[PDB]
Amino acid sequence: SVFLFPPKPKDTLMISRTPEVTCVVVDVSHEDPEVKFNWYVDGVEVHNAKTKPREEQYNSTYRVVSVLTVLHQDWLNGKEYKCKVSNKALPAPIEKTISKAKGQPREPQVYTLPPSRDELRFYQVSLTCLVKGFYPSDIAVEWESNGQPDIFPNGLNYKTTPPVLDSDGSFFLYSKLTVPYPSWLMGTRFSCSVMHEALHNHYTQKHLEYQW
Amino acid sequence: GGPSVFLFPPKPKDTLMISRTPEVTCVVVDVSHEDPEVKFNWYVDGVEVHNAKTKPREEQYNSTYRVVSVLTVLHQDWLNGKEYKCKVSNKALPAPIEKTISKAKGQPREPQVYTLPPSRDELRFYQVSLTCLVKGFYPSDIAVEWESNGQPDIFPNGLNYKTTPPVLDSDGSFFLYSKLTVPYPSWLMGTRFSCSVMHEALHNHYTQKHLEYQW
Numbered sequence: 001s002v003f004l005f006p007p008k009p010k011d012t013l014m015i016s017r018t019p020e021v022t023c024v025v026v027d028v029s030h031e032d033p034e035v036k037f038n039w040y041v042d043g044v045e046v047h048n049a050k051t052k053p054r055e056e057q058y059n060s061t062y063r064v065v066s067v068l069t070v071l072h073q074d075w076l077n078g079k080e081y082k083c084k085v086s087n088k089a090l091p092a093p094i095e096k097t098i099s100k101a102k103g104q105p106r107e108p109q110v111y112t113l114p115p116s117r118d119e120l121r122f123y124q125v126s127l128t129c130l131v132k133g134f135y136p137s138d139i140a141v142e143w144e145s146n147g148q149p150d151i152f153p154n155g156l157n158y159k160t161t162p163p164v165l166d167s168d169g170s171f172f173l174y175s176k177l178t179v180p181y182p183s184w185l186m187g188t189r190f191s192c193s194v195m196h197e198a199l200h201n202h203y204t205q206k207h208l209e210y211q212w
Numbered sequence: 213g214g215p216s217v218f219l220f221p222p223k224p225k226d227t228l229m230i231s232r233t234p235e236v237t238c239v240v241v242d243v244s245h246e247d248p249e250v251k252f253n254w255y256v257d258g259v260e261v262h263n264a265k266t267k268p269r270e271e272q273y274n275s276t277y278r279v280v281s282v283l284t285v286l287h288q289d290w291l292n293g294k295e296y297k298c299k300v301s302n303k304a305l306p307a308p309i310e311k312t313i314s315k316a317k318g319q320p321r322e323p324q325v326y327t328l329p330p331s332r333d334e335l336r337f338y339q340v341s342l343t344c345l346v347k348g349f350y351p352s353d354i355a356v357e358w359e360s361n362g363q364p365d366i367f368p369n370g371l372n373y374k375t376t377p378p379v380l381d382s383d384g385s386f387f388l389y390s391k392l393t394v395p396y397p398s399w400l401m402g403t404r405f406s407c408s409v410m411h412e413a414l415h416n417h418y419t420q421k422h423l424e425y426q427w
């Protein structure tokens with residue numbers, strides 16, 4: 001069986017990062033550990049990929065991974081990436097194809113919402129980031145603060161929901177940042193950072209802070 | 213070749229409302245035209261039961277059948293954590309397949325339900341977002357709905373809302389958001405919108421928080 005994976009959204013949107021398609025091969029036997037990979041971008045073969053050391057599994061199978069570095073603009077422009085796997089236990093090679101989702105890109109709207117009055121009873125309060133109206137669903141969301149590091153030594157404690165298909169064919173998600181009520185009253189500025197293909201510089205940022 | 217079994221839990225709203233009929237569903241896939249017969253045996257805490265109902269086998273677009281057996285469960289039985297076991301027999305299986313499902317173990321935790329008005333920056337648009345935060349509940353089985361006192365000429369097809377799936381939070385509990393999209397005029401109009409949350413750990417398995425424009 002073959003599994004072909006897309007690049008990480010944040011990798012395709014930042015020039016400094018390295019996006020890559022990942023072609024995983026499973027059900028590899030001990031008698032047949034040979035695996036060959038052929039990569040094709042829009043049908044044209046490319047030879048920049050790199051195979052990884054075969055991973056022995058606890059169920060007596062191997063896991064063979066082949067990575068291909070892609071150009072950010074190639075993936076965003078919708079070029080197809082095809083992985084071709086050859087093995088003796090396979091009558092013929094397996095070809096999987098992956099590409100970015102089709103459809104006109106749509107720009108996310110980012111809204112920050114303070115905690116409810118009813119939540120201030122608790123020591124931990126919830127800072128909310130609403131990201132709606134974007135397409136495709138590939139997106140990256142993070143939180144930041146201008147707080148000094150001992151205030152958040154282990155970083156910020158936030159979770160983000162997966163994209164949800166909205167009633168108009170676009171996607172939305174929420175990201176929840178949990179902070180102590182004192183650091184909220186302290187006036188610290190917290191920032192929801194959203195990275196998406198349709199944004200200017202693939203990046204936008206919305207802030208949230210208390211006012212005494 | 214070989215069939216595969218998948219055992220699914222009841223729907224959260226069905227187990228939390230006494231008026232509803234919750235049921236465990238045992239699905240069998242990759243059943244071929246040859247040997248389409250499938251036998252089911254059900255066991256609640258090991259005790260065999262004969263209350264199940266098999267449904268007519270669905271011919272699939274890949275030349276396989278899909279044979280479904282449903283078992284009605286008692287609201288109290290499921291919430292108390294009884295195990296439901298499905299045993300599938302078919303001439304294509306060297307031996308039967310046994311799948312077991314039950315409610316998640318662990319002390320149930322009560323959700324906190326918070327309603328959030330739209331961001332000031334969203335009022336540019338005719339459609340605005342009313343948010344319901346549901347956090348700190350366990351297990352993840354939950355149902356969320358919205359309601360309003362709005363008139364039908366503004367909402368002829370009902371309310372337009374979507375809810376995220378539960379997300380595991382950093383403390384082992386779950387949280388989700390539910391988004392209700394309404395026209396900005398009906399928000400300014402003073403219409404009252406209500407977030408309804410149904411979970412085993414709530415009083416009467418139900419709670420409701422309101423949201424309306426503040427002057």
Ligand SMILES: *[C@@H]1O[C@H](CO[C@@H]2O[C@@H](C)[C@@H](O)[C@@H](O)[C@@H]2O)[C@@H](O[C@@H]2O[C@H](CO)[C@@H](O[C@@H]3O[C@H](CO[C@H]4O[C@H](CO)[C@@H](O)[C@H](O)[C@@H]4O[C@@H]4O[C@H](CO)[C@@H](O)[C@H](O)[C@H]4NC(C)=O)[C@@H](O)[C@H](O[C@H]4O[C@H](CO)[C@@H](O)[C@H](O)[C@@H]4O)[C@@H]3O)[C@H](O)[C@H]2NC(C)=O)[C@H](O)[C@H]1NC(C)=O
Nearest residue numbers: 216218220221222223237239241242272273274275276278
């Ligand atoms: C021939 O075609 C069959 C059905 O037709 C296909 O259906 C889908 C899958 C598309 O491919 C269509 O294009 C096509 O027509 C195939 O049957 C499917 O087999 C696969 C396994 O190969 C099953 O995958 C399993 O899916 C579980 C989820 O199942 C729920 O959600 C599905 C949506 O993805 C939905 O289709 C299912 O019907 C089911 O829906 C729930 O039903 C219950 C009761 O009926 C309801 O109470 C719920 O509300 C429903 N919920 C939803 C959301 O609809 C997974 O849970 C399961 O996971 C298991 O394995 C993974 C990894 O292996 C583990 O991570 C995990 O822990 C767990 O162990 C698995 O992914 C799929 O469900 C089957 N579909 C149906 C409809 O039965 C045949 O495989 C195919 N044969 C071939 C190609 O040879």
